[PDB]
């Protein structure tokens, strides 16, 4: 009746877009870097180990100074670790006990947390008497919080379980812009180094490029086959790669609006939990559920090394702001620093 | 200098480690329970026995701390957030009496989940009194949903309430065998099932959970010594 011409028009739009992608696709990136000396093997060993968590760790985040890192666990605690001296700086007792993500503000004054409580709690560090308390309880989401990233001292984008991302406003509690369009639970999102664009990967096997100012999906990136668990931007800002539960990592390009290379292996069945990029972008680190991570060459799809320091499945990892080292957290309540 | 700041971090670390020990002492003495139910399963009646998406009831019985967690406030997609309950003591499942096939296809996915292979499930068949009048009146028998109920036989170990139609006892044990055959289909000794029965006026629900949770902790200790 009425849904016929709308679905048929939506179908034709997908074919002409697919034809436009193949029309602008002539040489694969794998063939371009074929005449380049590969890196080969890299010798990365564990440097620091953290032993101050009880329950499994979900997410973590580094800092702009590459000094501290915050992590969350089911015990209801937020520990701001010291990456050099292995000294705990803060221990925030959470009211809830099902936190699923955490974030570190670029200024180093605020931290984030969220989970099954459907409330994103911002904790201020530079308080008056040194007692860390909650600043604003961002309520309004109709689902569990999956990931969040700070933008400024009063702006933060959250990705809840109601297939909608919201640009909150601290000190006011009212949502400024809500990003809708996903049909699945958004799991993780990454921010470009311009605070203007961000991509969100949901459980519908598609990553949508959003705009912070206007507030709608600018571009839609497809190609995956299962739920997307993580996503990360390329350092230059014109590309990004993501992982899913199909044990494949695909690198997409914003300007080309299509994938460039796939990073996967035959004997890898476990899904990717977290992804990260190096400073130069040559190395691609992706976590897995088989209790160890991997390092991939982002230009030739060669596995440069396997990092197997953890005992349980890894759930979060990230390269420092200067790329000197990379941390990794797993479900064994243990955090490690790899370099 | 750097010695003063480093000493401040050492003092702050020991203060946190002291708080981590004090909180770990009160955390290992509590048992986390996931109260999960279907749509209109009547799990709020169990809460009476002692927006936001999680409800916590810290009811204590026999000087033992129990921490229940309600699901009300979340969505129907239980794929990504069910992984958060791989460390709880047990998952309390409530079934209200096709609302039965949906309960058996969810209990099946939880039992076969790769991260929930060591979490035990406690069952509580709610709406027993209404289930008795539904099969007695015959307006909607379980025969249309399950045609195998006619071929089922009542087990000899049935302990029904005196003065009840054995058809209700046959229906209760048929639902129990349906959930048990799913649990023992992939049961490798890491986690077992504890089916029970509950009505709208039963007051011994906290004692059933206490006896079920006692069996779980008592059985997992036997696996540490490889006695089982």
């Amino acid at each position: 009746s009425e849904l016929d011409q709308l679905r048929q028009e939506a179908e034709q739009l997908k074919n002409q877009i697919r034809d436009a992608r193949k029309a602008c696709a002539d040489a694969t990136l794998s063939q371009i870097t074929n005449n380049i000396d590969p890196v080969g093997r890299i010798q990365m060993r564990t440097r620091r180990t953290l032993r101050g968590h009880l329950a499994k760790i979900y997410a973590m985040h580094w800092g702009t100074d590459s000094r501290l890192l915050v992590s969350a666990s089911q015990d209801g605690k937020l520990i701001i670790w010291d990456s050099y001296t292995t000294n705990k700086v803060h221990a925030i007792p959470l009211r809830s006990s099902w936190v699923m993500t955490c974030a570190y503000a670029p200024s180093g004054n605020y931290v984030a947390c969220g989970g099954l409580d459907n409330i994103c709690s911002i904790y201020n560090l530079k308080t008056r008497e040194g007692n860390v308390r909650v600043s604003r309880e961002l309520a309004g989401h109709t689902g569990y919080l999956s990931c969040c990233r700070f933008l400024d001292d009063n702006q933060i984008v959250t990705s809840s379980g109601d297939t909608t991302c919201a640009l909150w406003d601290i000190e006011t509690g009212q949502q400024t812009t809500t990003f809708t369009g996903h049909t699945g639970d958004v799991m993780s999102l990454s921010l470009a180094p311009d605070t203007r664009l961000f991509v969100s990967g949901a459980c519908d096997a598609s990553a949508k490029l959003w705009d912070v100012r206007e507030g709608m999906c600018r571009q839609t990136f497809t190609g995956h086959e299962s739920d997307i668990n993580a996503i990360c931007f390329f350092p230059n800002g014109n590309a990004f790669a993501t992982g899913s539960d199909d044990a494949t990592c695909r690198l997409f390009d914003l300007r080309a609006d299509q994938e460039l290379m796939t990073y996967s292996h035959d004997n890898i069945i476990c899904g990717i939990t977290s992804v990260s990029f190096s400073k130069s972008g040559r190395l691609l680190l992706a976590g897995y559920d088989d209790f160890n991570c991997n390092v991939w060459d982002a230009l030739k799809a060669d596995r440069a090394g396997v990092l197997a320091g953890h005992d349980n499945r890894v759930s979060c990892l990230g390269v420092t702001d200067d790329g000197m080292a990379v941390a990794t957290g797993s479900w064994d309540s243990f955090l490690k620093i790899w370099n | 200098d750097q010695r003063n700041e480093e000493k401040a971090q050492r003092e702050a670390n020991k203060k946190i480690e002291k708080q981590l020990q004090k909180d770990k002492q009160v955390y290992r003495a509590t048992h986390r329970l996931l109260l999960l139910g279907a749509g209109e399963s009547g799990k709020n009646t169990i809460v009476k026995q002692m927006t936001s998406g999680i409800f916590e009831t810290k009811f204590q019985v026999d000087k033992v701390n129990f921490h229940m967690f309600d699901v009300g406030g979340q969505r129907d997609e239980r794929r990504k957030w069910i992984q958060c309950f791989n460390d709880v003591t047990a998952i309390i499942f409530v079934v209200a009496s096709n609302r039965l096939q949906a309960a058996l296809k969810l209990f099946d996915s939880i039992w076969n989940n790769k991260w929930l292979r060591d979490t035990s499930v406690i069952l509580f068949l709610n709406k027993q009194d209404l289930l008795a009048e539904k099969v007695l009146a015959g307006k909607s028998k379980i025969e249309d949903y399950f045609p195998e109920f006619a071929r089922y036989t009542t087990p000899e170990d049935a302990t029904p309430e005196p003065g009840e139609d054995p058809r209700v006892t046959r229906a209760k044990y048929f639902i129990r065998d349906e959930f048990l055959r799913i649990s023992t289909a992939s049961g490798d000794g890491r986690h077992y099932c504890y089916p029970h029965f509950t009505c709208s006026v039963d007051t011994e629900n906290i004692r059933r959970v206490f006896n079920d949770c006692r069996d779980i902790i008592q059985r997992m200790h036997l696996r540490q010594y490889e006695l089982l």
Partner: nanobody
Framework: QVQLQESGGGLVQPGGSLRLSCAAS????????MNWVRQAPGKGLEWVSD????????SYTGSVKGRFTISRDNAKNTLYLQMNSLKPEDTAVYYC?????????????????????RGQGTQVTVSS
């Protein structure tokens, strides 16, 4: 881009036969467990059947157990659903659902009303 298109279905006489074909694309058919789900008019979604990776583990719901027949072809990426002796109570739209993670015994969110890994389905009506 995961795409699931269902074929067949329509007005069928009571006691007849019907067949539904589920064409799959955008993923490897030999790695994901497939399911079936129906939505009765004015009622919530109801699970129908499911098939394992190689078609070994087959399970049906009690309403249509033994009555229906399912089969999959990994080389063609096409799913089949056979119906025999249709009843006036089975009139509903049938969706071709696939639970997300590959090589997993669990199979979640098939019955949920907001699921991305399932097609628009085909309406099946049984009347005179």
């Amino acid at each position: 881009q995961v795409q699931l298109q269902e074929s067949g279905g329509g007005l069928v006489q009571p006691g007849g036969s019907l067949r539904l074909s589920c064409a799959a694309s955008g993923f490897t058919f030999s790695n994901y467990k497939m399911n079936w789900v129906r939505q009765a008019p004015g009622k919530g979604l109801e699970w129908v059947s499911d098939i394992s990776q190689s078609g070994a583990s087959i399970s049906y719901t009690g309403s249509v157990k033994g009555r229906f027949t399912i089969s999959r072809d990994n080389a063609k990426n096409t799913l089949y659903l056979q119906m025999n002796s249709l009843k006036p109570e089975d009139t509903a739209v049938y969706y071709c659902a696939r639970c997300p993670a590959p090589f997993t015994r669990d199979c979640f969110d098939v019955t949920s009303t907001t699921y991305a890994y399932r097609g628009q389905g085909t309406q099946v009506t049984v009347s005179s």
